[PDB]
Amino acid sequence: DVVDSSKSFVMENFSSYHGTKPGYVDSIQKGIQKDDDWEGFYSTDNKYDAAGYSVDNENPLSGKAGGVVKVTYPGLTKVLALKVDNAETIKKELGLSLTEPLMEQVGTEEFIKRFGDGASRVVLSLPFAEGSSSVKYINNWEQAKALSVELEINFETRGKRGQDAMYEYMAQACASCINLDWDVIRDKTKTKIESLKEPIKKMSESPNKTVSEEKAKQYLEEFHQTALEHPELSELKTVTGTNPVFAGANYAAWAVNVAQVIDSETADNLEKTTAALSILPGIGSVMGIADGAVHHNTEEIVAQSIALSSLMVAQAIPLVGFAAYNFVESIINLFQVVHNSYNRPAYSPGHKTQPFLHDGYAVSWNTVEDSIIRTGFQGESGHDIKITAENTPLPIAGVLLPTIPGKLDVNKSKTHISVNGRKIRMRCRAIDGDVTFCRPKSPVYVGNGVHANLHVAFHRSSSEKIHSNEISSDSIGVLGYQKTKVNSKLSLFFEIKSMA
Amino acid sequence: VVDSSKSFVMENFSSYHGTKPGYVDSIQKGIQKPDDWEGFYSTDNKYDAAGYSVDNENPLSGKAGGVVKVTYPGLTKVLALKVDNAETIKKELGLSLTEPLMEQVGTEEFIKRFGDGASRVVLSLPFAEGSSSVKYINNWEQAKALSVELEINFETRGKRGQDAMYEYMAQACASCINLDWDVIRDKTKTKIESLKEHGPIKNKMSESPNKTVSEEKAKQYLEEFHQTALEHPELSELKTVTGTNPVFAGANYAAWAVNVAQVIDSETADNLEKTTAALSILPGIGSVMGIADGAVHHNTEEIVAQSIALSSLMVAQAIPLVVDIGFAAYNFVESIINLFQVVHNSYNRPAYSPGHKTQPFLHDGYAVSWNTVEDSIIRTGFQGESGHDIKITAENTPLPIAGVLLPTIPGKLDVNKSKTHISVNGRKIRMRCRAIDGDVTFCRPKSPVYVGNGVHANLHVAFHRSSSEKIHSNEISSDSIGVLGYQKKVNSKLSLFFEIKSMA
C-alpha cells in the first residue's frame, strides 16, 4: 500500500507556503501560473523551509532572497500523503495509465473522485526532507489556478544587507536559538577593523613580499597575539584562550588558506568568493563553533572574531580591499548558514542513528528502535550498537548498562559482543543497584576494517512502567581505551517508551 | 516467523560444539545436561565452535579444550527462526505460552506439527551480527540421541599459549594471515638475547637514568633507545618497513613502552591473565603490530618477531624510568602474542570494508555511510528510477561538503538531476549537476554544506535508467560514489562503495 492514511485528510481553506525568487514576489500574488511525472506547483506546510527556495537562482550562495507567499484553496481540498516518491510504483498501486504523467492524472475529474473524498481537488503530500518534520505539497498546475495568494514576507522590503532578512526570518522558528542582529555585527565589525589599523602598525615587521607557508604562518601567529592585546578584542582574547580550536595558530592557518585561493577574478565577485571560501577547512576557528556548540553567540564577540580574521587575511595576502569588503560579506553569509544548521531540530551524536565520534571511535545505535527501551511489559528486549574506529586497533573495555532494582535487568546470557562475526561472551557485574558493567571475555579491538556489534539484552520482571525517577542515566556507556586513568567514553543515548 | 528458506530436513544432521579443557573426552560419551532457551548449543561452523573452547576461569589467556562433532541418527528438521524473542515465537506459533519454548520443542506434539516427518527439531538462529554462521539450539532430551566424534583437541597439539586454537581458526581462509607462532616465539627469544649483547645497545642502557624520571624524559630517552636499537642487524627489516608510516615511528614504540610500565604493577606482572587484561585496554598497539589503514603490514614471522623483540627491550628500559624487568621477556611477550593473534583473527574474518554496505567510512574528521544496505545497491535490468541515501557528519568543527562524483553509463544510466539533493539537519539543498565526461557526473550543492558535531547531512542520489538492459561490468569504471570534502589542490575524498544487482 502506498497512501499513508494517518497523514491524509480533507480540510477547508487549506493553506501552504511558497518560497518566491526576487522579482516574482509582487507578480505571484496575481495568481499561480507555470521529471514530468512530478511537474506541479510546489509548496510546504513550513514557511521557514519555504524561505529557503527564495534566493536568486543565478547567485544561490550570495544572492538576494525574494520572499514567501501563503497560497490557499477555497472550499475542500484533499491532502493525499504518499509513502513513496516512485511514480511508476504509485501509478501501479493506484491503477492509472502508466503512460500518462502522475501530476496530470492528479488534476483530473476521475482522480479527484476516487481519492478526493468529495473535496474539489487533490494535493499530494510527501516528506519534505530527511531530518525534517515538514512536508512538501505538489499541486496540479491547473487546479493551482484556484489558489489565492497572500504575501507572508518580502525579504527585499526589509532593505537589509546580504541575506540577513532571510536568515533573521528563519531564526524566528526557534523563538537554544542563535538570533543575532547582523546589522549591529556588520557595524561593530567595520568600526573595530578601522579602530585597529590605527603596536598593530606589526605591519612594519611584515615581509610585504611572497614568502614560505611556514614563514607566513609563523609571522601570522605573532600578529594574532599582538592583535588580541588591543582592548577592542578583549572579550575575544578571553573566550578564545583555552579551546585549541580557537588558537591563533588556527586563525593563522585559516588566513593563509584564504590568501592562497583568492585570486583577483575571485575577490571582485562575491558569489565566486563565497564558493571559494565555502570549501575550506578551519572555519570553526573563526566562528567559535566546536564540540557541538556555537560558542561565539553574541554580536560583540562575533564582530571581534570577524574583525580579527579580516585583519589577518589582509596581512596574509602579501606573503601568499578584498579583506574588509568581499571577504567580510562572504564570511558573514557562511556564519549565517552554520548558525541556521545549529538552530534547526536535529538529533545529537549518539541519539537515534546519529553516530557518536570520539577518540577515533565511531559508535551508533543500529536502528532507531534499538535506541528505545520499551516498558510496561514483562519479558525481554535486545538492542544493537555498532562500533568501529578510524585507523589502528582500539580496544573496547566494556559497557555500562542501566539497571532498575527488580524492574529492569541485564540478561547476562544474551548480552554479547561480536567482532567481525566472532561472538564474544561477556562477564557482567553490578557496580551498584543502578549500573551493571559488562566486559568481554576475550579482547575486543576495532579499527579500519574491524567492527563490532554490541548486543545488549534486557529483562523486565515487572509489568510496571519505568518511571524517570528510577533511571539515573539516559545513556549506555561504552568504554574505550584507558588514558589520572580513565577510559574513553562512548555514549549511546536511549529513550524510555511504552509498548505501541 | 519461520524462515522457510533456511529450514530443511536432513539425514545424519551434524554440527559442532566447542568444548572446554577437561571435557574433550567425557563429552564424547554423550550429550548430558550439567529458561526459555535452556538447551545444548552448537553451530554449523567448526571455527566458531573453537571460539567457545577456552578455559572459563582464564578466558583471556587460558588453554583451549577442543571441538567435537555431534550427529543425529535418522532424520532431523532444522527449524530456522526470524526472531529470537521467545514470547514472540510461542504466540505466532499458536503454542503454549506457559511452558519453556525449548522444553516444548522436544515434545511429540511440536515435532509432529513442525518436524515434517523427522524424529526431532533443532532451532536455527543467526550466529551473530556480521557472521554467516548459524547457532543450533537442541532440546536436552533429544540431544541424548547425539553421536559425538572428536574434531580436534587443542591441548593434544601441545603448543604454547593459545597457538593451537588460533592456527586452527586461520584454516578458514586457506589474503589470510597464517603465521607459525612457534617460529615467531623462537625468533623473538633469539633476537632479544642477541640484541642484549650488542655494543651500542648496552652502551645506551648505561645512559639510562635507571631511576624514576618524568614521563616526557622517559619518552625522549626511550626514543633514543629505539633509534639505536633499530641499527642492529637483527632488526634490519623492521627499520625498513617502519621507516615511513608515522604509526610505526619510534615515538609510538616509546609511548607504548611507557604505557606498559605505568600500568603493570608487581602482582599483575606475575599472572598472565592479569597482564593480558591490563595490556588489552591500552591504546597504540597497532604501532607494535604494524596494523594501520585497514591492513596487517607486519605479516611475516620474521618481521613480527623483530617488532615484538624490540618492544620487549623497550618495556625493559621503561620499567625503571616509570617492577622487575623480567616481565619484559616473560609475561609481556606471552601476553602481546595473544593480542596479536586476536587482531590477526579479526582481519582474517570475512567483513565489509569501510564504506561498503552500512559500514562507515571515516576520513579527515568525516563519517559517511549508506543509510541502509539496499541504498548501497544500484539495481538493474529495468527502466525507471531509484533513490539512494548517504549519511554524512563530522567529528567536531564545521567541515564542508563540496560535491559528489556520481557514475553514469551513456545511454543506460543517468543522474536524475531533479530528485538528487542534499539535506542538512532537515534543510533541503538543491544541487547543480554537470557531466565531467560520459562516465562521471559532478553535483555541487547550490548553497554551502557544512557538517560537524550536531550537524548531519543526508545526500540523496537519484538514478534514472533509460534501458531495461542489465548493466555490464564493461560499463561502470568505478564501484564507488565519491563525496568530496574540504579542499587542501585536492579534495578530501569520502568513498561509498556500491554493488550492481539485478532485481528480486
Numbering used by the authors:
A (entry chain B): 4 to 37, 47 to 187, 200 to 222, 225 to 227, 229 to 347, 354 to 516, 521 to 537
B (entry chain A): 5 to 38, 48 to 187, 200 to 347, 351 to 516, 522 to 537
From the publication, what sentences describe this entry?
DT consists of three domains—receptor (R-), translocation (T-), and catalytic (C-)—and similar to many other A-B toxins it enters the cell via the endosomal pathway. Following translocation, the C-domain is proteolyzed from the R and T domains and proceeds to inhibit the EF2 translation factor, leading to the termination of protein synthesis and cell death.
DT was crystallized under varying buffer conditions in an effort to determine if conformational changes, particularly in the T-domain, are observed with a decreasing pH. Since the crystallization conditions were identical except for the buffer, the crystals of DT-5.0, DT-5.5, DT-6.0, and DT-7.0 have similar unit cell dimensions and diffraction resolutions. Interestingly, the residues between H223 to P234, which span TH2, appear to become more flexible at a lower pH. In the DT-5.0 structure, the TH2 helix could be modelled in subunit A but not subunit B. It should be noted that this region does not form any crystal contacts that would cause conformational artifacts. We demonstrate that neither catalytic nor receptor-binding domains change their structure upon this acidification, while the T-domain undergoes a conformational change that results in the unfolding of TH2–3 helices.
